[PDB]
Each structure stands twice: as C-alpha cells, then as structure tokens.
Coordinates of C-alpha atoms and ligand atoms in Angstrom, one line a residue:
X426 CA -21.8 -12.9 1.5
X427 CA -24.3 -10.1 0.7
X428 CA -24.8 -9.4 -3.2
X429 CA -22.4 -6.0 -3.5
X430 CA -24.7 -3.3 -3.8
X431 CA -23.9 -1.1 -7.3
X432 CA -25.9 1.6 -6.5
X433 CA -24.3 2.0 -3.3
X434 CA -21.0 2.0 -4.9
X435 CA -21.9 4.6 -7.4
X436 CA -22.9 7.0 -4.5
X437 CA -19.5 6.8 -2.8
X438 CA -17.8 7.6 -6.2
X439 CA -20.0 10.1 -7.0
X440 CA -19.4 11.6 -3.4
X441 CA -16.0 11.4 -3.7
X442 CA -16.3 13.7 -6.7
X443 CA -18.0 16.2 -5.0
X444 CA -15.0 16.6 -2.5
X445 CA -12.6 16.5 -5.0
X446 CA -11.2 13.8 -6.0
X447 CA -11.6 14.3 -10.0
X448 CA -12.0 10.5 -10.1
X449 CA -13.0 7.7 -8.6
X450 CA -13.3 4.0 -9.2
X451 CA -14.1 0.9 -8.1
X452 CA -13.9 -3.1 -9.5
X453 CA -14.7 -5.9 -7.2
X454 CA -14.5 -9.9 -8.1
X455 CA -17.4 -11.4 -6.6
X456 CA -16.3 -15.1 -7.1
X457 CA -16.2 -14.9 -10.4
X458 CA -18.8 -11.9 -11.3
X459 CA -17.1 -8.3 -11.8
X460 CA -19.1 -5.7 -10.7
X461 CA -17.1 -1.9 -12.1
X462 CA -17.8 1.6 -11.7
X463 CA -15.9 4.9 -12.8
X464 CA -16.8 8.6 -12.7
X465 CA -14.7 11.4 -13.7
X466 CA -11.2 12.2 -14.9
X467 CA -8.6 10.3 -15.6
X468 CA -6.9 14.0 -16.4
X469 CA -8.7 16.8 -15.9
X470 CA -6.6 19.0 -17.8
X471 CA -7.7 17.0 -21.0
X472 CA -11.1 15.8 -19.6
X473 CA -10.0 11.9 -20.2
X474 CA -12.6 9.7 -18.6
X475 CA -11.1 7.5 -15.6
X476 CA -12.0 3.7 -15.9
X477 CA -11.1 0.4 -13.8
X478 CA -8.4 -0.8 -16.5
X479 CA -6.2 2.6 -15.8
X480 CA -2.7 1.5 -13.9
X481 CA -2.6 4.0 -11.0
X482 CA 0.4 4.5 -7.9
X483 CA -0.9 1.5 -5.3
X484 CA 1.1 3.3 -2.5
X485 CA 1.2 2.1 1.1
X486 CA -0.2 -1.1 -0.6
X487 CA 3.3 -1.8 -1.9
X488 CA 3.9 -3.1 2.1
X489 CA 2.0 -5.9 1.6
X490 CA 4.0 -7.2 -1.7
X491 CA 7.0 -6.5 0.4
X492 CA 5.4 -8.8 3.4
X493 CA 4.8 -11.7 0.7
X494 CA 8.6 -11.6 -0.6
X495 CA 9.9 -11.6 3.0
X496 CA 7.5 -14.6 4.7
X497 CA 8.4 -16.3 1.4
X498 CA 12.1 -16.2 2.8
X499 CA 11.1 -17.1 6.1
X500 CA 9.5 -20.3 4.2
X501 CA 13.0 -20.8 2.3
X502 CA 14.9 -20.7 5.7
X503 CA 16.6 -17.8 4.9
X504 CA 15.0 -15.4 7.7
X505 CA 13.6 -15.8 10.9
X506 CA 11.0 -13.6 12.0
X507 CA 12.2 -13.6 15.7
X508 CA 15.6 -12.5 15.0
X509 CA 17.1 -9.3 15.2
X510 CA 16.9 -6.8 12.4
X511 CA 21.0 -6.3 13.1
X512 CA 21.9 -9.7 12.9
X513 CA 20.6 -9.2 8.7
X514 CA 22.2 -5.9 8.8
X515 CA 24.6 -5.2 11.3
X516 CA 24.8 -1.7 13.1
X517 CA 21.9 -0.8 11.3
X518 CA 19.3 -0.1 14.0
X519 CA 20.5 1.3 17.1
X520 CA 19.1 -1.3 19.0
X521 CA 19.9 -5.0 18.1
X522 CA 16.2 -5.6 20.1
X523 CA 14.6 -4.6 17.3
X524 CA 13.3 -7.3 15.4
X525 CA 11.6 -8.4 11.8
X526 CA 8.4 -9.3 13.1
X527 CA 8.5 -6.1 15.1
X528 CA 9.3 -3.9 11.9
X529 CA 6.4 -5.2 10.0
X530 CA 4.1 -4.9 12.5
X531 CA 5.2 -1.6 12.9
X532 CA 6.3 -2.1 16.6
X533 CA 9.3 -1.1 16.0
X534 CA 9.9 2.2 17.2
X535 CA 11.7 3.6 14.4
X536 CA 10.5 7.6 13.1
X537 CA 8.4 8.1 9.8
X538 CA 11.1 10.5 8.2
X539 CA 8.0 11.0 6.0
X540 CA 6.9 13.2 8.8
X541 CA 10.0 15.3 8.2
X542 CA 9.3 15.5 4.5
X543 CA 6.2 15.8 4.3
X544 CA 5.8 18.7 7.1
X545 CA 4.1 20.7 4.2
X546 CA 2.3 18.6 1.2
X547 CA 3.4 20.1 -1.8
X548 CA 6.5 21.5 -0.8
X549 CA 7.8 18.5 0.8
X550 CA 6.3 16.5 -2.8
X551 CA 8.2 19.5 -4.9
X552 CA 11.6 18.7 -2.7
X553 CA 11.0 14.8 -3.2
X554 CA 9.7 13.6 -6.1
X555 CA 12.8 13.7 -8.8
X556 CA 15.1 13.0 -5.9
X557 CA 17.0 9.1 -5.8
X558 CA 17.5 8.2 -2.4
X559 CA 19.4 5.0 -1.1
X560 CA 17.6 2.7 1.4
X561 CA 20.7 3.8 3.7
X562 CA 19.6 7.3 3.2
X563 CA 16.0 6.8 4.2
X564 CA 17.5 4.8 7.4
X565 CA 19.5 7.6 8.1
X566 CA 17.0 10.1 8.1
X567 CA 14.4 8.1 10.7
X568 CA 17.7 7.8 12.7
X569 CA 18.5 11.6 13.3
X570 CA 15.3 11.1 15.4
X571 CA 15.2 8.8 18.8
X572 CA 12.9 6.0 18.8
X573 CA 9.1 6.6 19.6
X574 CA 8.4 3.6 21.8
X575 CA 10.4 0.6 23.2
X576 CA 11.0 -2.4 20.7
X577 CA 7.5 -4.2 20.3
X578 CA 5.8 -2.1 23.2
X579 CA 3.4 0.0 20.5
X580 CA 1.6 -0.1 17.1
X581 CA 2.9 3.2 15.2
X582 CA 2.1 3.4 11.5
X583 CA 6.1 4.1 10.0
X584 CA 7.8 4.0 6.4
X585 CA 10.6 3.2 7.6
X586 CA 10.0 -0.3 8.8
X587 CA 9.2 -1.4 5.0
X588 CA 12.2 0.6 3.9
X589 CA 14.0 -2.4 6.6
X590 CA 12.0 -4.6 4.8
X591 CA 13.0 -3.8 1.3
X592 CA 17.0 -3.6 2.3
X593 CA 16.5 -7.0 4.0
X594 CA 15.0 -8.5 0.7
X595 CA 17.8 -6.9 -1.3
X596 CA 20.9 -8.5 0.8
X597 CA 19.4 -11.8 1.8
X598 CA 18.5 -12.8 -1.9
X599 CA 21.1 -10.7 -3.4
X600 CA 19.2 -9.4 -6.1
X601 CA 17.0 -6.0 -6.4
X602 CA 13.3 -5.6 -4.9
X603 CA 11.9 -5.5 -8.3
X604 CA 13.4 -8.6 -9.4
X605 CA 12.3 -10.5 -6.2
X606 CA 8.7 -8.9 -6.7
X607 CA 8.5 -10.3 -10.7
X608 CA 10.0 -13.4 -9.7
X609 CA 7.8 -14.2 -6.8
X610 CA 4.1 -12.3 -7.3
X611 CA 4.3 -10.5 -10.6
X612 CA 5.1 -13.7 -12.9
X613 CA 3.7 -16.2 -11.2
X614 CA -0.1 -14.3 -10.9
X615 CA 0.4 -13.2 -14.3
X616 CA 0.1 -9.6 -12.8
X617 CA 0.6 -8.0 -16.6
X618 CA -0.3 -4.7 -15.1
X619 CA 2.0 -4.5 -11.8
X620 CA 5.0 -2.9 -11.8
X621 CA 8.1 -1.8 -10.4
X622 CA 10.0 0.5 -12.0
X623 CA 11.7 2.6 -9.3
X624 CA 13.4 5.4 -10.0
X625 CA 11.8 5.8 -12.9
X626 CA 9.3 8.3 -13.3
X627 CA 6.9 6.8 -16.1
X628 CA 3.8 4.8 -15.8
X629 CA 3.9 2.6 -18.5
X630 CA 0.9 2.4 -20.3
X631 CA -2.7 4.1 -19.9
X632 CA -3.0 5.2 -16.5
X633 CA -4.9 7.7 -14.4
X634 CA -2.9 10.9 -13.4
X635 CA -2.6 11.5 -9.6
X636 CA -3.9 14.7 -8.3
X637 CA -2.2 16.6 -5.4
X638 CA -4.6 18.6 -3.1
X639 CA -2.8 21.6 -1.3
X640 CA -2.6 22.3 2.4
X641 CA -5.0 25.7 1.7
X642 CA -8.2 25.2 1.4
X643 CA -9.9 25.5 -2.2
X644 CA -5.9 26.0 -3.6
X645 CA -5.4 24.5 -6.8
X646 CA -4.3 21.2 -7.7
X647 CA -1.0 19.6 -8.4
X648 CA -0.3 17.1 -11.1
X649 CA 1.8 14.9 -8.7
X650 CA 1.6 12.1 -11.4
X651 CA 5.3 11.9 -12.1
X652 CA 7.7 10.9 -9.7
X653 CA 10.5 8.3 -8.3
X654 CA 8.8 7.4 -5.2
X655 CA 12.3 6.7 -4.2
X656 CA 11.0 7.7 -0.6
X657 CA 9.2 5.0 -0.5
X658 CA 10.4 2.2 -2.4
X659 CA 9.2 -0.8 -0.7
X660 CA 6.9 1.1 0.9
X661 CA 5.2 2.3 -1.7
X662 CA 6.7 2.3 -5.2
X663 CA 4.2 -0.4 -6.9
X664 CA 2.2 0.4 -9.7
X665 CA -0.9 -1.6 -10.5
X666 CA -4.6 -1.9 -11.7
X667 CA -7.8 -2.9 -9.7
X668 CA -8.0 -6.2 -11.9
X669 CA -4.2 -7.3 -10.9
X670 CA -4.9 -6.3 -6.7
X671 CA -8.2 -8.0 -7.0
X672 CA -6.0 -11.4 -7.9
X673 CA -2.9 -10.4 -5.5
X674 CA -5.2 -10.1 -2.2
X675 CA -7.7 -13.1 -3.8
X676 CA -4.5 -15.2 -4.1
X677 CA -2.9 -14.5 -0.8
X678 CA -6.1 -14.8 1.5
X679 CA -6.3 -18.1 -0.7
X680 CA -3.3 -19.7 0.2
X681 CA -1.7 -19.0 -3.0
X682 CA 1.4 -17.2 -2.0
X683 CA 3.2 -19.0 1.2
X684 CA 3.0 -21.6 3.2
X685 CA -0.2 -21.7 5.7
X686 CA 2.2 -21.4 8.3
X687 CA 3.4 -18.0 7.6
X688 CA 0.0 -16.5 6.5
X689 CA -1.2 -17.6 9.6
X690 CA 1.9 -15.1 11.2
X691 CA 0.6 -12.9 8.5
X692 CA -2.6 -12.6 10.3
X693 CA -1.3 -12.2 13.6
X694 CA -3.2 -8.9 14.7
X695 CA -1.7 -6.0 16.2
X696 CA -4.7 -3.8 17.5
X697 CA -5.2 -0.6 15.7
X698 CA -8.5 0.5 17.0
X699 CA -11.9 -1.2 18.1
X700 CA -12.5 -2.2 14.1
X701 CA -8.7 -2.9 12.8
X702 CA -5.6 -4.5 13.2
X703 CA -2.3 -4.7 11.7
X704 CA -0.9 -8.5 10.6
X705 CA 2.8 -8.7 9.1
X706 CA 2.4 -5.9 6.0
X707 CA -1.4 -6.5 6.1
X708 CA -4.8 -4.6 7.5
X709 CA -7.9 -5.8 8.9
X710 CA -11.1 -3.7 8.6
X711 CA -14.1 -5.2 10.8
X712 CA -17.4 -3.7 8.6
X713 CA -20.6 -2.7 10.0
X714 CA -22.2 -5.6 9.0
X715 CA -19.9 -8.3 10.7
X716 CA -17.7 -9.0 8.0
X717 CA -13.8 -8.7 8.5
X718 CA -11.9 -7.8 5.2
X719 CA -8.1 -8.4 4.6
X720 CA -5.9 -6.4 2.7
X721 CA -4.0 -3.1 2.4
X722 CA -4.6 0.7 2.2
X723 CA -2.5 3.2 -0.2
X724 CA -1.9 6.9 0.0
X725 CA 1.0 8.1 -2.0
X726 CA 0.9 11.9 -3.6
X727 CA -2.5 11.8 -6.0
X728 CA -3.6 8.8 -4.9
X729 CA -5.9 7.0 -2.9
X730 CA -6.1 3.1 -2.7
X731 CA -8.7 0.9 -0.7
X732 CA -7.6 -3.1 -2.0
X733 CA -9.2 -5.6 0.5
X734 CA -10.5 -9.0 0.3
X735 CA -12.7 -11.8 2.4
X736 CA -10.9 -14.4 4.5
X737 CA -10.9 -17.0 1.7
X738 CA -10.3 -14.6 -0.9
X739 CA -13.3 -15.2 -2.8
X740 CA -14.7 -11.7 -2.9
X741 CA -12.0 -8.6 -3.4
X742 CA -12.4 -4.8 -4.1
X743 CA -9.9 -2.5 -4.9
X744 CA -10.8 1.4 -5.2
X745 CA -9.3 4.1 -6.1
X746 CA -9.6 7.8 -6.2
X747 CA -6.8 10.4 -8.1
X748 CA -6.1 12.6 -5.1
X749 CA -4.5 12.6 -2.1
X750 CA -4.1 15.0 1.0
X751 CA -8.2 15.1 1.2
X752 CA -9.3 13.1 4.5
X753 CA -13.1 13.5 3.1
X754 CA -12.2 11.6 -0.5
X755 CA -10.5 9.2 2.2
X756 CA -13.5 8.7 4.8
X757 CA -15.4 8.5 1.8
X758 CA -13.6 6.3 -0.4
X759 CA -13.7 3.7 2.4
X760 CA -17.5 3.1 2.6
X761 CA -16.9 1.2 -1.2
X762 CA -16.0 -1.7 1.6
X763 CA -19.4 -1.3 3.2
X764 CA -21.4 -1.3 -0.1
X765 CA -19.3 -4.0 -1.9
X766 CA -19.3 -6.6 1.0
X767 CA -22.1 -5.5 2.9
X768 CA -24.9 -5.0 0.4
X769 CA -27.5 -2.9 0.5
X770 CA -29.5 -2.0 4.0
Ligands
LIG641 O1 2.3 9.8 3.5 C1 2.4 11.0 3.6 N1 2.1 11.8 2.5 C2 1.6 11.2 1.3 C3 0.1 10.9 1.3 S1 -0.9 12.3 1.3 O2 -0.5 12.8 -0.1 O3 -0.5 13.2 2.4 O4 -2.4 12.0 1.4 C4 2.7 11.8 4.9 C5 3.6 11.1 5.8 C6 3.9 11.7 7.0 C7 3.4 13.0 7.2 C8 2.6 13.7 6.3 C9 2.3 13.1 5.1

C-alpha cells in the first residue's frame, strides 16, 4: 500500500470543521504504525478538545458486529443462511420467501420504519430517543407498510433487516444481543472500549458528545448525545473507539472471527453502485486509486463513522466526525479513505 498521507488527512478534518461538524477525527493502523489526527470539540458547549481515544455512537456499524455473531452461528450449525427467516421465527415476516441471507444483504424487501421516524430530524430524535422499543415493536412498525421489492430481487438499504438479525441472535442462542456480542467479539479482541449497553442512555467513560444538525439551514444544534438507541439496537446501538474498530475490521478481514467459509459468504457482493457493494452486514468502497476497502459505515443522531480496512486487514481507518444530518461532513468525511489508503497524489 501507499504510505497514508497525514497532511491529507488533516485537510478532510479540517474541512469537515468548516461544514460543521465541531469535530473530527481520524486513527488508522498501518501494520503496526498509528498514524492520528483530531480537530475540534469533543463538546462545544465546554470547548473540550476531541481526540482518537474518545468512545463515540458507531451506528449503522453495529450491522457488521451483528453479521459476525450470526455467521458465527451458521459455523456452529445452528442457522442456515438459505433458510427462511419464518422457519427461526414463525409468522414473523409475511412472506416465509424471505430469507437470512436476503435480510442481511438487504434484499429483503422489508420498510425502514426509520423512514417513518425520522420524516423530520430532530422531531423524529425528540419522539425517539428516551423511548424502549421491543424488537417486535420495530417489526411491527416496517410491517404496517407493504414490502418494497420481491424477496432477493433488489438492494435497499433497511434497519429493519438487522432488527431480524438481532431477534434471530436473541432466540437461537437464548441469551441477549449484548451477551452474544461480549462473548464472541468484545472478550475475545479484548475490545475494552466497545460496548453495548442498550437501553441505557450513558456512555461510559470519556467520550465525544454527538451533535444533531437541524433540517433548517444555519438552525442550531442539538446535543443528541444521550439516548437508548432502542430503534436501532442491532442496528446500531454499539459504542466504541477508533483503536477497538481498527482491531474489529483488522481481525475479521484477517480471518480472525469465523471460519473462511463464511467470510467468504461475507464477501459475497451485492452491487450498490459502480464503486460499492454490500456483503452479509459488510461494505465495499472501490478508491480512486485501485484499492478496495472492507468494512462498515455509521450514521446515528450526532454521529458520523467511516471504519474500513484492506482485504487482509493489515491497514484499517476508522473516522469520525460529532454530527449528523450534514451530507457535506459525510461527502467529506469519506475522502479520510482516499488519503489514508491512497497516499498522496
Ligand atoms: O438514519 C436515519 N437518521 C439518523 C442519521 S442522520 O442523523 O439523519 O444523519 C434516517 C433514516 C431514515 C430516514 C431519515 C433518516
């Protein structure tokens, strides 16, 4: 690979800043030599200084630690990919065609209820965030709507096929999501600063707050720090740092976390457009430069989360900036992939 380029990476940050994310970091493990960047705020209410050791809400990156649990099960002979979601769960989906592979792919068909929720940012956030929802209630919500494509037929992004996920994990193993995750990824990667502490509303330890953009331009910000994130759950509840997802996507791209088998259905890619796919609860990003990267993207409220790594896991980057709702913090955000594993011009 390219030697990262720091200067590069300290533009995007600084970028990011001036569209308003009030900070922005990066770390990446470069086979052994961290390279790590911060500017801004942690808070800005206080002016705290945001660095690479402050936990932070992984989001949508939660899909892949859900993925690892369930192909870990399919290694145990406890779930086949191939079968229907209803034979797990009966009279859960309305149609028994639906199946695991198919749900995280997102080919499933099922409605984002997030659509529903989220119609307006900061309202929908204000309704959700000290709300406790059961998995049930979240499949019962994507349900009042019909299906948006026939089982397999389509990619289309939805929440609701990790919520599956995470009520799959929950009654084959018998035991709770955050149990599964300690046991399985947390413990044995010695992730000491993961967590899963659904519905509690805490971060445990230092930790950068999250940042709400509204839907009007130049309105003010929300602290959207605090919050159950019981609307995602397995889709999104994790909390983490860019040291521990530098070691969770290193390790799985590694062979680390399953059988080679099953990350090879892992990697099985669903187009997404000329320069991505979609794998089993995993992303691939095709870079300027010719490089494919492997990993997972987050957006949860106040949050932004780039964590991707190279095929044999030797070089990862996980980024982060405290806002969400600001497509030019995202855009912007995502070019710390270009600098870090593509170098300089
Ligand atoms: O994921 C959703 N919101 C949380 C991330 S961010 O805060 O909008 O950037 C979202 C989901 C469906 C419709 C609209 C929004």
């Amino acid at each position: 690979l390219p030697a990262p380029d720091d200067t590069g990476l300290q533009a995007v940050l600084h970028t990011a800043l001036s569209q308003g994310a009030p900070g922005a970091m990066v770390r990446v493990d470069d086979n052994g030599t961290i390279h790590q960047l911060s500017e801004g705020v942690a808070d800005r209410a206080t002016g705290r200084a945001i660095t690479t050791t402050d936990r932070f809400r992984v989001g949508s990156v939660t899909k892949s630690f859900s993925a690892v649990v369930l192909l870990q099960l399919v290694d145990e002979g406890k779930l086949d990919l191939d079968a229907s979601v209803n034979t797990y769960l009966p009279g859960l989906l309305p149609d028994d065609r639906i199946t695991v592979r198919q749900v995280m792919s997102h080919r499933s068909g099922l409605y984002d209820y997030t659509n529903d929720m989220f119609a307006q940012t900061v309202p929908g956030f204000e309704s959700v965030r000290n709300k406790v929802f059961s998995y049930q209630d979240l499949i019962t919500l994507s349900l009042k709507h019909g299906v948006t494509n026939a089982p397999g037929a389509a990619y289309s992004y939805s929440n609701t096929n990790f919520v599956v996920a995470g009520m799959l994990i929950e009654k084959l193993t018998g035991h709770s999501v955050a149990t599964e995750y300690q046991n399985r990824i947390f413990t044995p990667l010695n992730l000491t600063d993961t967590f899963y502490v659904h519905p509690d509303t805490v971060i445990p330890g230092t930790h950068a707050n999250g940042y709400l953009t509204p839907d009007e331009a130049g309105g003010a910000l929300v602290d959207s720090t605090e919050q159950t994130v019981s609307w995602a759950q397995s889709a999104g509840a994790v909390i983490s740092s860019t040291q521990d997802l530098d070691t969770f996507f290193s390790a799985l791209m590694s062979g680390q976390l399953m059988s080679a088998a099953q990350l090879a259905q892992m990697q099985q890619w669903t187009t997404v457009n000329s320069t991505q796919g979609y794998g089993l609860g995993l992303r691939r990003r095709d870079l300027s430069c010719g490089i494919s990267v492997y990993g997972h993207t987050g957006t949860v409220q106040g949050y932004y989360t780039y964590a991707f790594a190279s095929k044999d896991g030797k070089r990862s980057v996980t980024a982060l900036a405290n806002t969400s709702n600001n497509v030019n913090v995202l855009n912007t955000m995502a070019r710390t992939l270009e600098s870090a594993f593509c170098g300089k011009p």
